[PDB]
């Protein structure tokens, strides 16, 4: 699949569900990162755009209490790159996952209504 970053104006940021709908309207989904190669591809897109340290929705969303986090495209959550201490479900309201667009490419759980940039896969 091909990845595309969306870092529009800050008043153009979207919730997790709005971002999922945007990507699904293109016939795709929010990006799943299933291995280090995909991670590098996205990191290089970040460097090419020159937009460093920005946060982006990924396809991470909580499933049942038993499952924990899942990918919206149904891919397995085998590879994980959570930031240290994450997921921390801060204040019990963090059920979606974002990417921190710096070299570490780490993941964080955050409230799904938070406004973020996003990354689609097509
Ligand atoms: C600048 C600052 O002090 N931010 C605090 C939040 O931590 C940042 O959260 C963002 C989330 O996009 C990012 O992870 C930064 O690296 C953090 O410094 C803090 O958020 C809470 O703790 C985070 C570590 C993370 O788990 C986040 O999901 C969680 O809500 C909030 C709430 O304590 O306070 C901010 O001041
Ligand atoms: Ca993937
Ligand atoms: Ca968190």
UniProtKB/Swiss-Prot annotation:
Question: What domain of life does the native source organism fall in?
Answer: Eukaryota
Q: Which cysteines are joined by disulfide bonds?
A: 23-120, 96-112
Where it sits in the cell: the answer is: Endosome membrane; Cell membrane
Task: Specify the C-type lectin domain's residue ranges.
Answer: 1-121
The record's subunit annotation is:
(Microbial infection) Interacts with Dengue virus. (Microbial infection) May act as a receptor for hepatitis B virus, enabling uptake of the virus in hepatic dendritic cells.
Q: Domain description from the entry?
A: The C-type lectin domains, also called carbohydrate-recognition domains or CRDs, 1-3 have at most very weak affinity for carbohydrates. C-type lectin domain 4 shows the highest affinity binding and has multispecificity for a variety of monosaccharides. At least 3 C-type lectin domains (4, 5, and 7) are required for high affinity binding and endocytosis of multivalent glycoconjugates.
Protein function? Mediates the endocytosis of glycoproteins by macrophages. Binds both sulfated and non-sulfated polysaccharide chains.
**Entry protein name:** Macrophage mannose receptor 1
């Amino acid at each position: 699949l091909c990845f595309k970053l969306y870092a529009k104006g800050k008043h153009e940021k979207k919730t997790w569900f709005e971002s999922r709908d945007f990507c699904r309207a293109l016939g795709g989904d929010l990006a799943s990162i299933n291995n280090k190669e995909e991670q590098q591809t996205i990191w290089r897109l970040i460097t090419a755009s020159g937009s460093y340290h920005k946060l982006f929705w990924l396809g991470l969303t909580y499933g049942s209490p038993s499952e924990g986090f899942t990918w919206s495209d149904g891919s397995p959550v085998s590879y994980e790159n959570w930031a240290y201490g994450e997921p921390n479900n801060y204040q019990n309201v963090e059920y979606c996952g974002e990417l921190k667009g710096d070299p570490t490419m780490s993941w964080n759980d955050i409230n799904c209504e938070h406004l973020n940039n996003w990354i689609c896969q097509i």
